[PDB]
Structure formats: structure tokens, C-alpha cells
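Complex record, three chains
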Amino acid sequence: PFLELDTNLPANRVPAGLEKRLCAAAASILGKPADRVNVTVRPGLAMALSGSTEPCAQLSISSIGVVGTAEDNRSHSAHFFEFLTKELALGQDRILIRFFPLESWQIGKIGTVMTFL
Amino acid sequence: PFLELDTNLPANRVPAGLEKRLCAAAASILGKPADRVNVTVRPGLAMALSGSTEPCAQLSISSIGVVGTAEDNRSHSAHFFEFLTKELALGQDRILIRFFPLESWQIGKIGTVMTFL
Amino acid sequence: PFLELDTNLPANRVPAGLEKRLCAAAASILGKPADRVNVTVRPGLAMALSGSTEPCAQLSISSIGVVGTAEDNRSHSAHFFEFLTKELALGQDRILIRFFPLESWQIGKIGTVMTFL
């Protein structure tokens, strides 16, 4: 899975090791191994969420198979909100998530695509 | 709606308050309330647009229902180009926009997804 | 085409001119002119790839027509991996690529969309 997190918290207010802890958290939530989790954190951005520039975070989750239905994503969302509110010290009103299904032909790995691996 | 703006203008050349003014502008253009507009600005990046590293900006707009047809997006594009050329002091050759339709099952909000709200 | 590269290499470890060389490389690989190539590089990020925070890079490629099949993307992937491993001095285990087809109605250019140009 691919997780991308944008935040207007400065880099020195994002807890050290967050990108590693989000790999473990995603592994348990999504049912994929931690060594197949990719995390990108982009701090220090200028953001408005719901029209307000108070501290906030946007998460994007992309994966094959597991983020493609309302029922699956409801479960995922509840667990990611619990993790992120506690780690970033944000309220639930200051986080949004977007889910994007991928297919094997879209993922380039080791000079090929996943369709052939 | 979700607006993401990447630019190679340094942070100290992006006008103060842009993320707030882009919420108001998007509200009028897209016909959604400003308190449902989310803006992310990422300045200071290394960019080429049309093969040239002169100052430029890329905007991504994602929303339910309103960015899914050529005719709607033609209107949207004209209004966003007018706003951004004036705010960033860029020519129309130095801005591109991408539009992405979303569905309710893809948006995680308050620990659930929008399908159930 | 649109290329976006996220990396945890600091800005002062990304080779000068990379965004320009990636335009030329993409032109040859994708068969589109260099003056229609758009590159965004975001360095200095916090990243884990395959669960590891060692230096890494994520590339996203979006285009009309040419990134929509496994067979096309296998070829593209091999050539992008050769370019990026040499430029960034990374091993092939430290790069992933995502491919995203676009349609003409999604691209805002000169105040309209590409459907009408």
C-alpha cells in the first residue's frame, strides 16, 4: 500500500519516527505486510481544511483490492483516524482521507510492472 | 472539494493568505461552500512545465459530481486560470490543471466514509 | 505527460538539473515531445519504502493514451528505472512507479480543457 500524508505542522512538530509507525499501523489495518507499506510525509505545507488554516492533515491511501468498497473503507477510516488523532494531537475535524484503488498494471517495481511478478 | 497546488515559487514569493483566498474562489467557481474546500499549497519545489524551469504552478482539483465533464471543466478552468494568473503573477502558459472525479466511498471523514453521512 | 517525484534525499543531494534531464528522458521513453513534459520534484520528505527509511524515490507518471496497458508500462518502467537508479544513485529496490491514464477532459490548459484544443 501507498500512504501519502500532507500536513501544515512544521517538520519539528511531527513526531520522530511517524513514517515507521504508520507502516506498522497500516500493516494491521489493511492486512498487508509492513515490508510492502510505503509512506510519504510532506510537512510544513500551507493548508486550509474545511476553510480553516488551523493544524490539519490529509492522508491518501492507495492499494490493490482492499480500498474499493464503502464497507471496507469505513473500517479503515475508523482505525486510521484513531492512529492519526493520537500521533499528531489533532481533532477528528482536522483530518480527511482519500482512498484510491490500484491495479497491478499501474505499479512499476524492479524495472517491470506487478502484472508480471 | 480538494485543491492541491505545487509551485517552484519559493514560499516567500507566494502571497500571504493564498490558501484562504483559494477556498473562497473555489467556493464560487465550483458551487460548494467555502467550509467544504480543502487547499494544499506546496511551494519551493523543483519543476519543469512544458520543458521549462521558469516559475510555474500545477493545480489538481478533486470533487464529487462537479468535475466530471468537458463542459463543466472548461468553465472551471477559465475561472481558475483568471484567479491564479493574477495571484501568482504568472502567464497562462505557466499553469496546468488536472481534474479528478471522486465518489462518496473514497472520502474518509470523522472516522467513517461519506457514503454513510 | 506529468511526472511527480517524491524523495527523502535532501535537496542538496538531488543532482542539479534533474527536472530538465527527466523531461528529455520522458520524451524518449513515452514518445511525446519534451516541451509537453511536466516534472515536479519534491525533495527532503520523510519516507519509508518497503518499510525502510533508507534513501528512496516514488515516481508518478500520468498521460493520455500511453500508460494504460501492462505491456506498455513494463517497457516504460524498465527505461525509467535505468534513468533514475543512475541519476539518484539508488538501487532498484528503492524506487516504485505508479502509472495513471488521463483523458482530455481532465486537463485544463490556457483557460479551457484539452477536449476543445
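Note: The longest helix of chain B spans residues 70-88.
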